[PDB]
Amino acid sequence: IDAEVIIVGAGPTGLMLAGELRLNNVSTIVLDRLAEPMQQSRALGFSARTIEEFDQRGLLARFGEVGTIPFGHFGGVPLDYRVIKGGSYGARGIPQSRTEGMLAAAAVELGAELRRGQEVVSIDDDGTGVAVVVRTADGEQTLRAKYLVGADGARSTVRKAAGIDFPGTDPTMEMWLADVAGCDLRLRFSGELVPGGMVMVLPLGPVAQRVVVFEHATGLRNSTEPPTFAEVADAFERLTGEDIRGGKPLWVSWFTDSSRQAAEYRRGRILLAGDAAHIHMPIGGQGMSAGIQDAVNLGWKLAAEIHGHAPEGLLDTYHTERHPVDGRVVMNTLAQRWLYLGGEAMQPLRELLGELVRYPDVQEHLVGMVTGLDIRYDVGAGEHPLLGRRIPNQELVGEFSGKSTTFEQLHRGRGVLFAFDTAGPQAATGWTDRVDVVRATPDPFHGLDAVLVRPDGYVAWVAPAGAGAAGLDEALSRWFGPSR
Amino acid sequence: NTIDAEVIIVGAGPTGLMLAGELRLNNVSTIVLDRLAEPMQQSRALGFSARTIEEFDQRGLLARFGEVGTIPFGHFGGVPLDYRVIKGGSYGARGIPQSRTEGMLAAAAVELGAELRRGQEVVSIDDDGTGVAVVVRTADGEQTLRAKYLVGADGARSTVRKAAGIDFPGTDPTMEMWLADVAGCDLRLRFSGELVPGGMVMVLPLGPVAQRVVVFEHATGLRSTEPPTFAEVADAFERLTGEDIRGGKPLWVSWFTDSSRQAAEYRRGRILLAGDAAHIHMPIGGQGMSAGIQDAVNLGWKLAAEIHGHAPEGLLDTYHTERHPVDGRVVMNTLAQRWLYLGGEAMQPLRELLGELVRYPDVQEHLVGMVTGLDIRYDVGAGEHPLLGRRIPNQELVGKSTTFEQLHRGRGVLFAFDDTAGPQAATGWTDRVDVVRATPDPFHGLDAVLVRPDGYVAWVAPAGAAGLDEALSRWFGPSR
Ligand SMILES: Cc1cc2nc3c(=O)[nH]c(=O)nc-3n(C[C@H](O)[C@H](O)[C@H](O)COP(=O)(O)OP(=O)(O)OC[C@H]3O[C@@H](n4cnc5c(N)ncnc54)[C@H](O)[C@@H]3O)c2cc1C
Numbered sequence: 033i034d035a036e037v038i039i040v041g042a043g044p045t046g047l048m049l050a051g052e053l054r055l056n057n058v059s060t061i062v063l064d065r066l067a068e069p070m071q072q073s074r075a076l077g078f079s080a081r082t083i084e085e086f087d088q089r090g091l092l093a094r095f096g097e098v099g100t101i102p103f104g105h106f107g108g109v110p111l112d113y114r115v116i117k118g119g120s121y122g123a124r125g126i127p128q129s130r131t132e133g134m135l136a137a138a139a140v141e142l143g144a145e146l147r148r149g150q151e152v153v154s155i156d157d158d159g160t161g162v163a164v165v166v167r168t169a170d171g172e173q174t175l176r177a178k179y180l181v182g183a184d185g186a187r188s189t190v191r192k193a194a195g196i197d198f199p200g201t202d203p204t205m206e207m208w209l210a211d212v213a214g215c216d217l218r219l220r221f222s223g224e225l226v227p228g229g230m231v232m233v234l235p236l237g238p239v240a241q242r243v244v245v246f247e248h249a250t251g252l253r254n255s256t257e258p259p260t261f262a263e264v265a266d267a268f269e270r271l272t273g274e275d276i277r278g279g280k281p282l283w284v285s286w287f288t289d290s291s292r293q294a295a296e297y298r299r300g301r302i303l304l305a306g307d308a309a310h311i312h313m314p315i316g317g318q319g320m321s322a323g324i325q326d327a328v329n330l331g332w333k334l335a336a337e338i339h340g341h342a343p344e345g346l347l348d349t350y351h352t353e354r355h356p357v358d359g360r361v362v363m364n365t366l367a368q369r370w371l372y373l374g375g376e377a378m379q380p381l382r383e384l385l386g387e388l389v390r391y392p393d394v395q396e397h398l399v400g401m402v403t404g405l406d407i408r409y410d411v412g413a414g415e416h417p418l419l420g421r422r423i424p425n426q427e428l429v430g431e432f433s434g435k436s437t438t439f440e441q442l443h444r445g446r447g448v449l450f451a452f453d454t455a456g457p458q459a460a461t462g463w464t465d466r467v468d469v470v471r472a473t474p475d476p477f478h479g480l481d482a483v484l485v486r487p488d489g490y491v492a493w494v495a496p497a498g499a500g501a502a503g504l505d506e507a508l509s510r511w512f513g514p515s516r
Numbered sequence: 517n518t519i520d521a522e523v524i525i526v527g528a529g530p531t532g533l534m535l536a537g538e539l540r541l542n543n544v545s546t547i548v549l550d551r552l553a554e555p556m557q558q559s560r561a562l563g564f565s566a567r568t569i570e571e572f573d574q575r576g577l578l579a580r581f582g583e584v585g586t587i588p589f590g591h592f593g594g595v596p597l598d599y600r601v602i603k604g605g606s607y608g609a610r611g612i613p614q615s616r617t618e619g620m621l622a623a624a625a626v627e628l629g630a631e632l633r634r635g636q637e638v639v640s641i642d643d644d645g646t647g648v649a650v651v652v653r654t655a656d657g658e659q660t661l662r663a664k665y666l667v668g669a670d671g672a673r674s675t676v677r678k679a680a681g682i683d684f685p686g687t688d689p690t691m692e693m694w695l696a697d698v699a700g701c702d703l704r705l706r707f708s709g710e711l712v713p714g715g716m717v718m719v720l721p722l723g724p725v726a727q728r729v730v731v732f733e734h735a736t737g738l739r740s741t742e743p744p745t746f747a748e749v750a751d752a753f754e755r756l757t758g759e760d761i762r763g764g765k766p767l768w769v770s771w772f773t774d775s776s777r778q779a780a781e782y783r784r785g786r787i788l789l790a791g792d793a794a795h796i797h798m799p800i801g802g803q804g805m806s807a808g809i810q811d812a813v814n815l816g817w818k819l820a821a822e823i824h825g826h827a828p829e830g831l832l833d834t835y836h837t838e839r840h841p842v843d844g845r846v847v848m849n850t851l852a853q854r855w856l857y858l859g860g861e862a863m864q865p866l867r868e869l870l871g872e873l874v875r876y877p878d879v880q881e882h883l884v885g886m887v888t889g890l891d892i893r894y895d896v897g898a899g900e901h902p903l904l905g906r907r908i909p910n911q912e913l914v915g916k917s918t919t920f921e922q923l924h925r926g927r928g929v930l931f932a933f934d935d936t937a938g939p940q941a942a943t944g945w946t947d948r949v950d951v952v953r954a955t956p957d958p959f960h961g962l963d964a965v966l967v968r969p970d971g972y973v974a975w976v977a978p979a980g981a982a983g984l985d986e987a988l989s990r991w992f993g994p995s996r
């Protein structure tokens with residue numbers, strides 16, 4: 033074999049999973065047909081949960097200073113995204129090229145091999161390994177790994193070759209974007225309803241803006257080619273009366289509300305993640321972000337599989353955990369698409385939702401969906417609010433400096449038993465090779481003595497104040513496998 | 517110039533007749549005109565809202581009806597709800613056809629001295645700023661009638677609204693439902709409404725041998741201004757269910773659309789609007805007639821106080837400012853429900869989202885509040901106590917009485933829960949506000965509640981007479 037894992041696609045999903053696999057000491061090869069990274073950026077940010085999953089690995093610092101957007105919308109209804117702890121509408125002004133730039137740098141630094149101008153054309157799972165035919169410039173070759181991951185986009189070669197179904201809804205509309213320098217346009221970050229449709233203006237840097245247009249009168253073009261700048265500028269003008277034709281065009285692109293999901297995330301030793309497993313209309317943080325969550329869910333599970341300590345069922349929890357969460361992103365984006373872009377027909381449902389966001393528990397629910405901070409995985413019985421949820425980022429007073437954080441302690445990408453009493457640290461000794469013990473004092477941890485976290489950050493087990501390792505052995509064995 | 521009465525109401529529908537009752541309770545001379553020779557035989561509505569029950573019970577109008585049964589559960593655009601989440605709440609009154617409502621309202625109104633004149637069509641209106649002249653077409657030729665105020669309670673196509681020049685903005689119809697009342701078929705009942713391939717079907721009970729068949733198909737769109745024929749409906753019911761009702765007795769055929777419009781102004785000078793003349797929307801449950809009844813109960817005491825020369829400056833102008841937004845929320849919520857319930861597969865993501873949101877108590881209560889009329893809160897000025905601007909709940913008093921039993925005269929009431937501070941302050945207001953010394957957890961921590969003649973709380977005393985003179989003057993006018 034050329035590597036224990038081959039990843040098809042060096043977008044954010046593939047490069048993030050490359051990072052997680054190298055943290056696990058899984059030898060990995062990343063393939064991409066593109067000779068060069070895409071120069072233009074589709075996403076301009078990523079979600080609050082995606083901020084936390086970068087920060088969890090110390091990747092967020094590699095951007096430098098990253099600022100967040102406090103306010104946003106759901107289906108055109110304004111919302112303060114600070115109403116859940118750590119919540120925002122997403123990272124501000126981090127273009128997708130910068131994001132892929134950072135994740136490749138981290139993956140190559142950690143030993144992932146990146147090979148560009150390599151198109152996968154055929155895959156073969158025999159049930160002891162996976163083989164891939166790759167078209168280079170030099171000719172054709174055959175690479176081999178224990179597991180193949182398709183992170184290869186909306187038209188996933190791997191998904192098709194694997195025979196997995198991509199069911200959902202058909203495009204009912206398009207939006208067009210033009211990137212234009214020198215127009216000095218007034219921003220419209222959430223978009224803005226106007227007679228005839230909707231306009232967004234997003235910043236790109238001091239002298240360029242992205243204009244985004246939707247028109248009720250348009251009109252699926254039923255083309256595979258982008259609209260022209262002239263066409264986008266005509267749309268912008270009918271919508272706002274503003275003329276961008278004097279500007280310098282930098283890019284033109286488009287997207288639709290085609291909303292699909294892979295019926296299976298895993299067939300044998302073939303796995304799917306990111307846009308290969310789900311497409312939907314992009315809204316602000318939503319699109320790339322769940323691909324990063326997919327990769328962070330998969331990596332440690334695929335690695336425990338390959339290292340032979342995978343408990344019975346662990347790699348099957350990739351599908352049962354991520355399929356329903358990615359489906360909810362698909363659903364919420366479709367609901368917002370109709371609320372926001374459905375014209376006067378849908379005004380009553382916008383006014384109704386506008387009324388309902390007066391209730392805290394409604395603002396928290398909508399912010400939770402969009403940020404990715406509401407994710408709760410099935411980790412068996414127990415009713416502690418923290419159980420099955422993201423571990424939040426908290427200052428930890430311990431030995432270490434004499435100060436650290438909970439997120440600093442996940443850089444290694446290992447399981448972690450935070451001990452806030454020796455009982456838990458003592459039962460964990462079976463699992464030192466897979467779980468780190470951190471003794472430090474941190475409120476979501478209020479009446480708690482210990483928290484066990486899977487390597488993705490999600491709480492597998494707590495100890496209320498008094499209990500020792502009451503449930504810990506069962507917990508350790510479910511997610512990390514047999515004691516040594 | 518001699519006037520025929522202080523108020524002429526155009527329309528003897530439930531809105532007109534409720535208004536006539538309220539005006540007579542305020543001793544306003546009232547003529548009600550209707551072009552129809554008798555009340556409509558066929559019943560459009562088969563009930564009314566939890567708040568409409570209360571406003572009938574508020575006047576002792578629920579006694580020749582007997583016992584009013586309620587529906588404990590309902591839906592919001594398909595999504596099931598328990599409507600008892602609010603105290604006093606329900607999906608509305610069970611099995612009371614509109615004909616029975618109109619008979620009861622006509623009874624109380626003519627009893628109380630309102631003059632109801634049938635075969636009288638209003639064809640012309642002139643408001644010269646001192647009164648309003650109405651040209652009436654009768655079988656005995658034409659007459660001119662004159663009043664101080666004219667109220668259009670004259671339905672969806674208000675003669676009065678157009679003659680007053682008042683815009684009726686809103687949405688055009690996008691669909692039609694068809695109904696047919698059929699005796700003898702003994703159909704399976706479909707109370708809530710039931711989605712089937714190609715549309716939706718209701719079958720409601722009318723009595724032992726009669727059932728109402730309601731029909732909508734995504735394929736019919738819009739067609740004309742005539743009703744559909746019984747055959748067009750029976751055909752539709754077979755396309756939707758396969759069942760054949762063509763061997764039953766046709767009793768009635770009709771239809772309604774999702775046309776959703778609201779009068780831009782509830783008042784222009786000496787012309788006011790109420791009920792369907794002020795708002796139409798697709799009828800869902802007790803929604804349609806119910807808001808007209810709340811309109812009448814908001815307006816009556818206000819238009820009386822204006823005519824009798826004691827209105828606070830601005831009192832009658834609160835008819836528009838209170839009722840326009842509230843009736844707005846009915847038009848909005850019912851359109852919302854029409855797109856959730858009947859919007860098809862493209863609306864499934866929104867059905868799923870609202871499915872998720874209703875698991876929160878406060879969104880259940882919000883939706884149940886909207887639909888029942890129990891959420892209504894009027895601007896009554898400063899104060900954060902939860903009762904202010906809301907309906908007074910029906911409570912037991914102490915030999916013993918009810919808060920509602922005290923509202924039958926349709927006057928303001930000072931509910932004094934031992935003190936004589938409030939009742940002394942109200943001495944100047946005794947001609948319009950009645951003092952009830954009686955003891956009644958919604959009133960907990962209160963020594964007194966002041967209530968407008970419509971049942972809405974204008975002021976409360978925490979444990980004396982602190983601002984009662986301000987509240988009395990605002991709602992009931994200058995002291996004697
Ligand atoms: C116009 C537009 C605007 C968008 N806006 C947003 C936004 O605002 N926010 C947001 O979160 N998301 C947005 N998205 C979506 C977002 O870009 C995606 O969710 C994200 O790119 C997913 O990354 P991925 O790595 O999963 O897939 P991709 O980034 O598509 O990566 C797939 C990679 O696989 C490679 N590949 C494919 N097939 C093969 C093969 N056979 N052999 C080798 N290599 C192969 C391709 O070269 C490509 O590099 C937008 C998309 C569009 C089109």
Ligand SMILES: Cc1cc2nc3c(=O)[nH]c(=O)nc-3n(C[C@H](O)[C@H](O)[C@H](O)COP(=O)(O)OP(=O)(O)OC[C@H]3O[C@@H](n4cnc5c(N)ncnc54)[C@H](O)[C@@H]3O)c2cc1C
Nearest residue numbers: 527529530531551560561638670671791792799803804805
């Ligand atoms: C098929 C159907 C089903 C419905 N189902 C329900 C339901 O289930 N629940 C619900 O709450 N509501 C329902 N509604 C609506 C409900 O019937 C109305 O909201 C209610 O009748 C309005 O009362 P109103 O007094 O405001 O108007 P109307 O009842 O329309 O009364 C208006 C009156 O004015 C008279 N008039 C009009 N113009 C003139 C004129 N120029 N001169 C003299 N008289 C005039 C007419 O004769 C008429 O009697 C339904 C309506 C329809 C059509």
